[PDB]
Structures are given as C-alpha cells and as structure tokens.
C-alpha cells in the first residue's frame, strides 16, 4: 500500500528506527532544538499518530510504515530525485523532493523498495518493486508538466562546457552569448535555448549505492526537463578519452529507462 504523512510524523517515525537524518535530498531536518521543544513535539506527534492509527494504544508504531522509513533512511541501493520548477510568483519556492530506495539483504531476488515523495509540508511513502522500469518512469515524472517528448534528433556537448555555460547564464551573461559560446549547430540551438532558459522545470536524478560500509554516488546526474516544445532528456556518458559528455535526446520514457539503468551501471552493482 501507500501512506501519506507530514514531515513531523515522518521525523518521529525516523527517530523510532534510530535514523540520525533523512536522505539529504528529501530536505527533512530536525524540527525541534532544545529539550522542551523535543517534549512538545513528541507529545503532539504521539497524539496525532495515535489518532490516525499508526501508533497503537500500547505505544507501537505500525511495523510496515516504520520499515518503509527504515528502507528510506538506510537504503542499500537508491536513486534520488530533485524537482526544480517555476516559482509561486509570490516569491515562494516549494520543495518537491523524491527518493527511490531499495533495501535487500535476502529477498522476498525481488527488489521490494519504497518511494518517498516530499511535497511542501507533506511526504508520501509507497511500497513497490522497481524491477520493471515501466512502473518507475511515471513515478519520477509526476513532478513535471507531463509534456510529451519533444521532436528533435539527439546531439551532445561536453559536460564541462555545458556546466560552465549554465553557470555563466546564472551569473548574468545574456543567453545569446552563452549559446554562441556553446558552438552548437543551428538546428540544435533552439532545443538548448529552451533547456537553459524559459520555464526551467526539471528533475535531477542521482544514483547511489551502499557497498558494505562505504557509500558511493555518481559523479554526474541525469536530467529530465520540460521545454515549451516538449520533454528533453540530458544523459551524461564517458567518451573514449574519459571526458564527460552530456547528451541531449528526446524525452521518451524508453530513453529515460535506458539512461537510468546506464547511470546505475556505473555503480558497483
């Protein structure tokens, strides 16, 4: 099943399983500071969870939900989603942060895991198996305009140049000079200009895994953007000389799945 909670409930259950922090991407931090606020928080959350059915009258959190939080906080293999989008126009940026967590030491292998989507004041946990990509792709796309994949053919530029270009655009360099600095063909120009500017609504997906005690994450992430033309996929890859090359392709769910598995392939899994 699935359970929608607040970030305070989720934090309490996270303290129940002895988790120091939530995954950094989810941006769920410690709501209180001192012992007094600690007490008040614990009381409030105890009452709320009790009345919503999660906390038994004998004072036990529901094992399923708690184990979901356990998977999220202590994943063996995970990939995190960071949703960037347009401002509320009142100046307020609302947090949309997902994560896909898989903890398997034995089996049920199956690959049963939990997806955690934190939007604003709420966070939803959903138990599923990510074995098939067709289930996963729509999950990471719900934070988007759901534009159909744009029509253009794949091109690419080195990740270094694209990154420095984006940074130049951040720092006040006009778009035209940036695109001129890129050196893309005239046909590939408008796609890039739509990716680097305008609406700017996209997901940053980053793979990670836990090997024994050591945690390892990808040096470069995967981007899924929504332009006014459609959905564009930015997928990094290693060239023959070891140079990082970002590749702009249509945003079809197939290409998304392939790019995801390719991204996870760089991890010791």
Swiss-Prot record:
It is found in: Cytoplasm. One of its GO terms (cellular component) is cytoplasm. InterPro entries: EspG. It comes from the Bacteria. Keywords: Chaperone, Cytoplasm. Pfam families: ESX-1_EspG (PF14011). Interacts specifically with ESX-3-dependent PE/PPE proteins. Specific chaperone for cognate PE/PPE proteins. Plays an important role in preventing aggregation of PE/PPE dimers. Belongs to the EspG family. This is ESX-3 secretion-associated protein EspG3. The lineage of its organism: Bacteria, Bacillati, Actinomycetota, Actinomycetes, Mycobacteriales. The gene is espG3.
